[PDB]
A paper describes a structure:
Kinetochores couple chromosomes to the mitotic spindle to segregate the genome during cell division. Knl1c functions in the spindle-assembly checkpoint (SAC), whereas Ndc80c, a heterotetramer of [name], [name], Spc24 and Spc25, is the major microtubule-binding component of KMN. Many fungi, including [name], utilize the ten-subunit [name] complex (Dam1c), which self-assembles into a large ring around microtubules, whereas most metazoans contain the Ska complex. Here we describe the cryo-electron microscopy structure of the budding yeast outer kinetochore [name] and [name] ring complexes assembled onto microtubules.
The intermediate resolution of the cryo-EM map and the incompatible symmetries between the 16 protomers of the Dam1cRing and the 13 protofilament microtubule necessitated a divide and consolidate strategy for structure determination. This approach generated reconstructions of Ndc80c, and a dimer of Dam1c protomers at resolutions of 3.5 Å and 3.15 Å, respectively. Dam1cRing assembly follows a shoulder-to-shoulder configuration. Additionally, we resolved a ‘staple’ density located at the inter-Dam1cProtomer interfaces that was truncated from C. thermophilum [name] (38). The Dam1Staple comprises the N-terminus (residues 1-26) of the [name] subunit. The staple bridges the [name] and [name] subunits of Dam1cProtomerA with the [name] and [name] subunits of Dam1cProtomerB. Contact with Dam1cProtomerA is through hydrogen bonding between Dam1Staple residues Thr15 and Ser20, and Dad1A. Binding to Dam1cProtomerB is mediated by a salt bridge between Arg22 of Dad4B and Glu16 of Dam1Staple, as well as packing of Dam1Staple residues Tyr17, Leu19, and Ile21 against Ask1B and Dad4B. Serine 20 of Dam1Staple, a target of Aurora B kinase, is buried at the interprotomer interface close to Leu39, Asn40 and Asn43 of the [name] subunit of Dam1cProtomerA. Phosphorylation of Ser20 would cause steric hindrance and charge repulsion that would disrupt Dam1Staple binding. Our structure is consistent with previous cross-linking mass spectrometry and insertion mutagenesis experiments indicating that the central segment of the [name]:[name] coiled-coils proximal to the conserved [name] loop directly interacts with the [name]:[name] C-termini.
Numbering used by the authors:
A (entry chain I): 57 to 98
B (entry chain N): 3 to 94
C (entry chain O): 2 to 125
D (entry chain Y): 1 to 72
E (entry chain b): 1 to 70
F (entry chain d): 1 to 55
G (entry chain L): 15 to 75
H (entry chain c): 1 to 64
Write the structure that this text describes.
Amino acid sequence: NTIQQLLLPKIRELSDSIITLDSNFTRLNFIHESLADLNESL
Amino acid sequence: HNLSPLQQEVLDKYKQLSLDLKALDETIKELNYSQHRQQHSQQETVSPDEILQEMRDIEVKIGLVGTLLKGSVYSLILQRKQEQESLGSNSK
Amino acid sequence: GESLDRCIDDINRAVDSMSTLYFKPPGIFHNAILQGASNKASIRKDITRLIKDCNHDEAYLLFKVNPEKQSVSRRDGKEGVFDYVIKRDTDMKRNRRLGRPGEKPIIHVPKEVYLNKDRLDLNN
Amino acid sequence: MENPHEQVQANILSRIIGNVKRLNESVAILNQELVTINNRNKNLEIMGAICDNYHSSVQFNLEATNNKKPPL
Amino acid sequence: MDSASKEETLEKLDQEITVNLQKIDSNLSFCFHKITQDIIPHVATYSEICERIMDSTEWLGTMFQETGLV
Amino acid sequence: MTDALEQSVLALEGTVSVLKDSVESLKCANEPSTNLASTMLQTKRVFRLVPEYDV
Amino acid sequence: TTDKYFIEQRNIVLQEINETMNSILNGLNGLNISLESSIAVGREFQSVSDLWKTLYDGLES
Amino acid sequence: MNANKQRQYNQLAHELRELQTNLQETTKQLDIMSKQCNENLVGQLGKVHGSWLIGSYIYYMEQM
Amino acid sequence: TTQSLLKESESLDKITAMIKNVTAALKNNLPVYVNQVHEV
Amino acid sequence: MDSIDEQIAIKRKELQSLQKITSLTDGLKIQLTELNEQIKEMGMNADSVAQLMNNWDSIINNISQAS
Amino acid sequence: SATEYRLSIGS
Amino acid sequence: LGLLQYAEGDYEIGPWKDSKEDLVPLPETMVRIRVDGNE
């Protein structure tokens, strides 16, 4: 009861961190595509 | 110390959960190791060699390709504007 | 509680999206440049790969060479990809001399001429 | 149109501000950690003080009565 | 001196400001890495070591407390 | 604008000087502790006591 | 007595779980900070890549 | 002077002053930590306990 | 109680599955991603 | 267009201030490295003291076994 | 939407 | 023209290779024809 409550915040911050990491990796993928295009032109 | 079967099932499930817990912790660490080619390894783990040490290495010279063209065009425009304002102010 | 279920679902969605990411592989010209600057033997291998020295006799028998214009054409007079590229470039230069703007993509891929004959070659 | 370097400096300064904020947060966390450790260890100087006092006391007693025997 | 070269010098100042900003950013990032990855973990290790200290000597502590009412 | 820049210069100079003082004092205080701990306080555990009852 | 022992085992494993999850969260936070630094320094490359799209892009045209 | 860069530099100055205060606090805490470590951990506890242990070791080694 | 134990069990099954998925993703997909980015 | 020498002076003063900040940040980096090394040294000394003091727990366990 | 260094500690 | 030779699947050399020599993509190979009027 209260002990699963003691856990649940930790999984909550884990979820927040994972979502942020996912978004960061999508942005990094955009940057990667930009780098590839610049490489090809040059 | 005898325990109920449900409690024992809870306990060994807890054990397995702790096992893959420290497994995941080790995996996340290994990602965070900046020990690329420092420890025994040949793969890049996200670290300055993927960041400012590397991306900034790119950036201190990418300006020579992109921003310098603009800068030159802007400098010509600025010189033209200087000539125009000088002629306009002095002629009148 | 339901918050645990929501967190688990959000994490699963994040992981599924994370797996589906695709990072673009290197293109055609990056390979040429990097393998031609990779290793001392690699530079020679890439120079051999990219540019060949054809048999001058075969080329002369198959291509008229104009030293006055320093141009190359087929001996049979058949138009090739070089002729298309040169004609396109000359046409665009003529249009530029008439004040028309240039093409925003400068390097135009000769898709049509290559395709119309290469697809038949693949059929054959 | 506009000076090309303006946006570059804007972004660079923005990132500098961000990482300096990161530095401030990190050093604040470090300060909290150090405060915690000092308060926790506030028993150790007590321990050391009484140990030193006991050592000095037994040495002084071995001086008062001459039971201090030669070293080995 | 020169006019083309004086515009060149203005552009020099622009380039130097940019590169100095880049160096400053790199230095501050290195400082952040040093603080987060090295200093704080060593402080935590020292904390654990001192806790082991005070744990190992607790038998003396409880003796001294029992008779000194400290 | 110069006010802000010289203010930052003064602040970071203060930080650097304070760190100079702290590092020097820390080194001076650590030298004797290192001297004592590295030499005399060395301890090697070669054995573990074992009741023969378990044996 | 058995229930008490069950509880104390629970507390032990839960506190070690708490510290391990602390470590995991700190590692992920540091990784995210580094990644966002990478993104922040990289975002400027999109403009220059877009400018160089005018020379050669390939499939787009 | 660009107003945007003006505000950026003002924010930079504020953050650096905050950094200076935090570093001053860190220096105090590190001085206290050094005092607790060198004088107490090894200076009094370590020295006295090591002295006792080596004395007992010598006594019982000569009593081999 | 018994129902509390049952709900704890199914929640733990969910936790195990979710963190196994997270571990697999972090071990497989991310290193190759970062390696490709570094190569580029 | 606005006075050139005014922009020149502003840029020069910005440049000198920026160079000062860069050198000062390098000094800060060196100081951080030195501070970390000192913390390492004192942690080593503390861990040596811990290795020394584990003997008391060993003694207590020995007496309990012998009892 | 920028992560901040938050070292968690204890419970 | 080399952009037409290689299908989308051939670009996945090295790390990009879909792991359930390879003739890595190169631009269409050129022959150098002498034009200066000599042999």
